[PDB]
């Protein structure tokens, strides 16, 4: 499920809660115009996970990637807090939700 | 169970021992006002895992996150040493306790 | 499968999409003339995964390696975006594609 | 079992060889007075794994932690080279020894 | 199996190809005179994996460690490119070779 804190923190922003998503792809891309981490759901929706060059976004972005990678590789659900102001939508928070 | 060392180290602080917690969620959040790592128990309690910018808190905080992530992903218990001076409570030490 | 985003981002470059590859080897080599990460398919084709010294190529190249390592160790498929301008061909994007 | 090299290197120091230990706990602690990584065996012995701020102790200490973490999480044995000059004893070398 | 590229790159150096080795130990040692990462085969042979302080040897040596660690923990074979000019012999390249 989704933690109350996760839902409440997402509700304090312009981003949308996406609940119990099954990710089936994660990619890393070093191409000039498309650099970044993308994740895709079984339905084919794609999100972008922004990177962080400085503390604390550096280690926090790294944990977002580890959560997404584990979700794809172990086939376990996540909750996303995602901004629809971009295409693909940007992940601003992610929660591992295996049960 | 809880190592005697873990219990004794927690007793030397203002933080409370939480024994045999089953974590079911871990999240990473880069939103401006809620930046951080959160973990949630099957009962729905949430804790915050502080970051560390400098040695040795940088590598120690990283190991706390690896313990929490493994606990969620593998569904294994932890012991927490948690400060109630914050909401959510802050984790100041964590022990992986699979058996 | 291949995410539409992965296919479309690869089509915007001179690199070719390689779909549902089964990687059976990954190597790391510190020899003077051959330094780098190589990955090999069950058919015996080899690709090179370039490194990155600076942000953001440093963390992105690290994620490309984690995807390739998981693909080999867990025997799960990937999609590659690979440049044929080099021998072995260079991976410019990789997508973990378990199902 | 224990590699001959591991045994011989430990014998060249003041530290004691501990063979085929089953680790059942690992913790990370950022409390002011008890900062560090601790591991505990099924028999109830506890060790401290020192950190390293500079090359090469930084990456070597990180590998010691990965070995201990995997030993706990996977329930597989290690060999330790531990100094009794401190309580808890300090780990100066660790060997993953699954079989 | 051994990738043709892995074999050919090793043949361009003074190092020897060691094929389908089963590693049963990996150790990290911070002792003054024996600092380093060692791996040992089921036959009892030991190799040393050199570290790297600077780009690109830093990330490449880290990937060699991850390959060796996975080989030990998951009991899967590797290929080594190893120099006999040292005792223990130095690993200059390693290939994960599960099947
Ligand atoms: C109205 C309006 O547009 N309000 C905006 C606000 O506009 C101000 C600016 O345009 C400045 C330029 O200086 O002018 C101000 O007016 C000034 C005038 O220029 C001065 O010269 C002088 O006369 O004084 C006046 C008054 O000060 C305008 O007031 O600008 C702010 C800052 O961008 C906007 O704040 C955002 O508001 C939205 C909802 O309205 C959200 O609260 C957003 O926060 C979040 C989000 O939820 O989207 C939080 C979220 O955690 C965060 N995500 C991450 C990953 O950190 C995102 C993210 O940072 C952004 O969405 C990315 O763009 O933002 C507020 O930041 C305000 O809406
Ligand atoms: C006749 C002779 O000694 N030739 C060696 C050469 O001598 C130089 C003189 O000709 C010059 O006038 O005076 C200089 C002194 O100021 C020199 O003495 O020196 C070169 C560079 O040292 C030697 O090159 C080495 O040659 C080896 C085989 O002949 C071998 O090719 C070495 O390359 C490798 C290797 O295969 O062993 C390439 C490996 O990828 C590399 N491994 C790593 C991890 O990078 C190793 C490694 O760097 C060395 O083994 C470490 O000692 O080197 C090559 O560099 C030349 O033989």
């Amino acid at each position: 499920g989704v933690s109350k804190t996760f839902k409440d923190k997402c509700a304090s922003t312009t981003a949308k809660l996406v609940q119990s998503v099954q990710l089936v792809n994660i990619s890393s891309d070093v191409n000039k115009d498309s650099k970044g981490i993308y994740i895709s759901s079984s339905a084919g929706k794609t999100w972008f996970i922004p990177g962080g060059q400085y503390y604390p976004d550096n280690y926090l972005s790294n944990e977002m990637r580890k959560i997404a990678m584990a979700a794809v590789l172990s086939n376990v659900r996540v909750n996303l807090c995602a901004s629809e102001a971009y295409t693909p939508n940007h992940v601003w928070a992610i929660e591992l939700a295996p049960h």
Side-chain angles (χ1 to χ4, degrees), chain A residues 3-15 17-31 33-96:
Chain A
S3 69
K4 186 191 194 278
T5 297
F6 190 84
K7 178 166 200 129
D8 291 350
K9 292 316 189 179
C10 195
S12 303
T13 75
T14 52
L17 170 63
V18 191
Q19 285 199 39
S20 320
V21 181
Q22 189 47 68
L23 299 173
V24 297
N25 298 114
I26 179 168
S27 56
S28 184
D29 181 347
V30 297
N31 283 303
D33 288 321
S34 61
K35 270 178 186 190
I37 304 291
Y38 304 82
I39 54 167
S40 300
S41 69
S42 39
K45 189 155 174 56
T46 291
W47 301 255
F48 175 81
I49 306 176
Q53 180 171 13
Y54 278 93
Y55 185 89
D57 290 10
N58 54 1
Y59 83 86
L60 289 169
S61 69
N62 198 42
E63 297 298 334
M64 296 183 67
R65 294 188 299 268
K66 292 180 182 189
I67 289 164
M69 179 89 67
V72 172
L73 186 58
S74 297
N75 195 53
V76 291
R77 303 274 172 155
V78 301
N79 307 311
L80 300 170
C81 181
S83 166
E84 306 189 326
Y86 313 81
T87 304
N89 295 172
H90 284 203
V91 180
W92 290 347
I94 185 170
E95 181 169 63
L96 192 56

